[PDB]
Design an enzyme around this catalytic site. Structure first.
Site, mmCIF file in Angstrom:
data_model
loop_
_atom_site.group_PDB
_atom_site.id
_atom_site.type_symbol
_atom_site.label_atom_id
_atom_site.label_comp_id
_atom_site.label_asym_id
_atom_site.label_seq_id
_atom_site.Cartn_x
_atom_site.Cartn_y
_atom_site.Cartn_z
ATOM 1 N N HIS A 72 36.016 26.387 8.675
ATOM 2 C CA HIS A 72 35.542 25.515 9.732
ATOM 3 C C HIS A 72 36.606 24.560 10.248
ATOM 4 C CE1 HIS A 72 34.827 22.085 7.091
ATOM 5 N NE2 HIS A 72 33.812 22.659 6.469
ATOM 6 N N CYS A 78 36.665 17.970 2.623
ATOM 7 C CA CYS A 78 36.507 19.422 2.660
ATOM 8 C C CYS A 78 37.775 20.073 2.131
ATOM 9 C CB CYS A 78 36.165 19.895 4.068
ATOM 10 S SG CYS A 78 34.585 19.245 4.655
ATOM 11 N N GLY A 110 36.750 13.974 5.236
ATOM 12 C CA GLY A 110 38.084 14.442 4.884
ATOM 13 C C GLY A 110 38.200 15.100 3.525
HETATM 14 O O1 LIG Z 1 34.628 15.655 5.827
HETATM 15 C C1 LIG Z 1 33.439 15.944 5.988
HETATM 16 C C2 LIG Z 1 32.494 15.482 4.925
HETATM 17 C C3 LIG Z 1 32.212 16.168 3.795
HETATM 18 C C4 LIG Z 1 31.264 15.612 2.849
HETATM 19 O O2 LIG Z 1 30.922 16.136 1.797
HETATM 20 N N1 LIG Z 1 30.712 14.368 3.215
HETATM 21 C C5 LIG Z 1 30.992 13.633 4.367
HETATM 22 O O3 LIG Z 1 30.478 12.544 4.638
HETATM 23 N N2 LIG Z 1 31.904 14.257 5.198
HETATM 24 N N3 LIG Z 1 32.956 16.652 7.031
HETATM 25 C C6 LIG Z 1 31.547 16.979 7.334
HETATM 26 C C7 LIG Z 1 31.414 18.480 7.552
HETATM 27 N N4 LIG Z 1 32.287 18.886 8.680
HETATM 28 C C8 LIG Z 1 31.990 20.193 9.204
HETATM 29 C C9 LIG Z 1 32.642 20.681 10.389
HETATM 30 C C10 LIG Z 1 32.330 21.950 10.922
HETATM 31 C C11 LIG Z 1 31.364 22.794 10.318
HETATM 32 CL CL1 LIG Z 1 31.026 24.348 11.062
HETATM 33 C C12 LIG Z 1 30.699 22.334 9.110
HETATM 34 CL CL2 LIG Z 1 29.486 23.304 8.271
HETATM 35 C C13 LIG Z 1 31.007 21.058 8.575
HETATM 36 C C14 LIG Z 1 33.683 18.619 8.395
HETATM 37 C C15 LIG Z 1 33.901 17.140 8.055
#
Ligand SMILES: O=C(c1cc(=O)[nH]c(=O)[nH]1)N1CCN(c2ccc(Cl)c(Cl)c2)CC1
Ligand SMILES: O=C(c1cc(=O)[nH]c(=O)[nH]1)N1CCN(c2ccc(Cl)c(Cl)c2)CC1
Lengths: 306, 306
Positions: free
Chosen positions: B41, B145, B143
Site C-alpha cells: 500500500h 507500517c 508511520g
Molecule cells: O501509519 C499508519 C498507521 C498504522 C497503525 O497501526 N496505526 C495508525 O494510527 N496509523 N497508517 C494507517 C494505514 N494506512 C493505509 C494506507 C493505504 C491502505 Cl490501502 C491501507 Cl489498508 C492503510 C497507512 C498509514
C-alpha cells in the site's frame, strides 16, 4: 493507537555482553572499550558468601584467574581493580561494538529496560521501574548476575543498573555502573529486607492520561482538588506524595488532552476510595505505576533513536 | 524468580530495518539479502485507498519511483515485484547484517515480539499474541507500517508478521512475510471489522502454572474435572475449547509442579465462576492469556539464544 509495556531496542547492548568466569563461578559482564564490568561477588566461593572480605579475596587473585569470553573469542585480562561493588577487568582488546554511552544513577520512580543474560548470552528484554524502596520487580534465574538495565536517549545508551542478587521476597537488588548499591543493601549472602514499598503517584497519573489518549474516559469527572487535599488521601493508601515538580512534568500530557493535572488528581482520588468496580483501564484491573510521564509521551507520540 | 512480559532481544532485526519512500508516502521495510519487503500500500495515494487496483498502480511505476534508505546509505532499486499483499524491491546491495532467518505463518494463540519502527528507525520492542480473531493488540502510531514481528529459535530469526493497518476498534491487522493477510482482511481503507475475540485457554493455564512456580497457590484446590466438563463451562465465558493436544503441550509444566493439567483446569473453572475476589495472580487482577506454555518454560528455566 494501543499501549504496551515497551522496552528499548536492545541491539546496542547485546554487543557488549560477555561471560566472566573466576574459578567455579560464571556470570555476565559488560564490555565497553577495553574494560569489563561485573559484580565483584564473582570472586567469592561457598565459604566467603556469608561475610566476605573483598580486599583480601582480590589480593589473592591474579589476572589469569579471570576468564572472559566474548562468544568464541577469549579476552586476555591484563589488569583488575575494584570500584565499590563492581570489579573492573582491563582486557587487551577494545570492544569494536562499543556504542556511545554514559553511566547515570537513577532516582526511584524512573524506568529502564533490562536485558536478561546467561553465560554472556542475551535471553530477553523487559521494562521495569526502580521502586521507591530501591528494589526492582524483575525476572532473573540463576546465572543472571551482571545483566544490565539501560535507557536510550537519541544515540546514547545510558547504563543505570547491574544485577547483583535476589532478596528473599523475590524482588531484585543491584548497583549503578560505578558499584554503588541502590538502597541499603550489601553484597553479602545474609538475609536482607527491603523497606516497605509505595505506589508511584506521578506514574499512575501519566498512565491515566495514556488511557484518556486511548479513548478510556469512564473514570473522569467534573471535580477538582488541591495538592494538599489529594496528598492527604494518597498517604492513606500508600501513595507517594505529589509535588509541584510532578505537576509541571505532567504538563505536556495535560495540554495534549486538555485535562488539568489537578482534575486528573480528583479522578484518581475517586478511584482509590471507590475502586474500579470490575472495570478496566487500558486492559488492566489495577492502577499501573511503571510508566513515567516520558514513557507515555514517547509511546503516544512515536519518538525513535539512532 | 519473577515473571515479566519478556520480548526477544531485537538486535538481529534492528539491522534489517530500512526506510521506503514512494512519492509522498514513507513507511518501513525489511532488508534481507538483496530484497526489501514492505506493504504494497506504499504505492497508493489519497484517491487509490478506498478501492485500489494494485496491478494497474504497480505497472505505472518504475524502479526510480522507490527510494530505499538504510540510515544514511541510499539503496538502488533494480527491480520490483508483488507477492500477494507485499512489495518486493530488489536492491543492488545485499544486507551484510542479514541473520539466519526463515518465514513462518503462525496460528492464533502463538506469541511473538514486535519491533515498532518509524522512518526505518527502531523505536521499541514488545511482546504480543495473535488473537483467535486474527488481530493483535499492538501499539503503533502513524508511520509504523512495515514493522515486523518475530521469534528467535537458537540462532534463527523467524519472521511471522508485517504490520499493515489499524482497525477502527484500535486493534491491528497485518500479513505473514509472504503477503497473505492474517484474518479476513484486505489492504483497502474501507471500514472492516474483526470477528469476536475469545480467550486463549491453553495460555491462561500455562500462566497459572507460572504463578505456582512463583509461589502463588491460593487458587488451587483438591478437585479435578474432565476435558468435557471443563469445556462446557469455558464456552459460557468465551474461552477457546481445550483439546488433547493442549493437554500434552502443558505436560512439561505439569511435571515440574506436580499438578495435573485437569487439576489446574478445575482451579480455572472455579476462577471463572467465582472471580478473583480482589486477589491477584502474578501481579494481575485479570486472567492473562498472552503467555504460551513455551514462553513460561523459557522464562522459568532461562533459555538463551546465539
Ligand atoms: O501509519 C499508519 C498507521 C498504522 C497503525 O497501526 N496505526 C495508525 O494510527 N496509523 N497508517 C494507517 C494505514 N494506512 C493505509 C494506507 C493505504 C491502505 Cl490501502 C491501507 Cl489498508 C492503510 C497507512 C498509514
Ligand atoms: O544467579 C544468581 C541469581 C540471581 C537472581 O536474581 N535470582 C536467582 O535465583 N539467582 N545468584 C544468586 C546470588 N549469588 C550471590 C553470590 C555471592 C554473593 Cl556475596 C551475593 Cl550477594 C549473591 C550469585 C548467584
Amino acid at each position: 493507537s494501543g499501549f504496551r509495556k515497551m522496552a528499548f531496542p536492545s541491539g546496542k547492548v547485546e554487543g557488549c555482553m560477555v561471560q566472566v568466569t573466576c574459578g567455579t563461578t560464571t556470570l555476565n559482564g559488560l564490555w565497553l572499550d577495553d574494560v569489563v564490568y561485573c559484580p565483584r561477588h564473582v570472586i567469592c566461593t561457598s565459604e566467603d558468601m556469608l561475610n566476605p572480605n573483598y580486599e583480601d579475596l582480590l589480593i589473592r587473585k591474579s589476572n589469569h584467574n579471570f576468564l572472559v569470553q566474548a562468544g568464541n573469542v577469549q579476552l586476555r585480562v591484563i589488569g583488575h581493580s575494584m570500584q565499590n561493588c563492581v570489579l573492573k577487568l582491563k582486557v587487551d582488546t577494545a570492544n569494536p561494538k562499543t556504542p556511545k554511552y554514559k553511566f547515570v544513577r537513577i532516582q526511584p520512580g524512573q524506568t529502564f529496560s533490562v536485558l536478561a543474560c546467561y553465560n554472556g548470552s542475551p535471553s530477553g528484554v523487559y521494562q521495569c521501574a526502580m521502586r521507591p524502596n530501591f528494589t526492582i520487580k524483575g525476572s532473573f534465574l540463576n546465572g543472571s548476575c551482571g545483566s544490565v538495565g539501560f535507557n536510550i536517549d537519541y544515540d546514547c545508551v545510558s547504563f543505570c543498573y547491574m544485577h547483583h542478587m535476589e532478596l528473599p521476597t523475590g524482588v531484585h537488588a543491584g548497583t549503578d555502573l560505578e558499584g554503588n548499591f541502590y538502597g541499603p543493601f550489601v553484597d553479602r549472602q545474609t538475609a536482607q529486607a527491603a523497606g516497605t514499598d509505595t505506589t508511584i503517584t506521578v506514574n499512575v497519573l501519566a498512565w491515566l492520561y495514556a488511557a484518556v489518549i486511548n479513548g478510556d474516559r469512564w473514570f473522569l469527572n467534573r471535580f477538582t482538588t488541591t495538592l494538599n487535599d489529594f496528598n492527604l488521601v494518597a498517604m492513606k493508601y500508600n501513595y507517594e506524595p505529589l509535588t509541584q515538580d510532578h505537576v509541571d512534568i505532567l504538563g505536556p500530557l495535560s495540554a495534549q488532552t486538555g485535562i488539568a493535572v489537578l482534575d486528573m488528581c480528583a479522578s484518581l482520588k475517586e478511584l482509590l476510595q471507590n475502586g474500579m468496580n470490575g472495570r478496566t483501564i487500558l486492559g488492566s484491573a489495577l492502577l499501573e505505576d511503571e510508566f513515567t510521564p516520558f514513557d507515555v509521551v514517547r509511546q503516544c507520540s512515536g519518538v525513535t533513536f539512532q
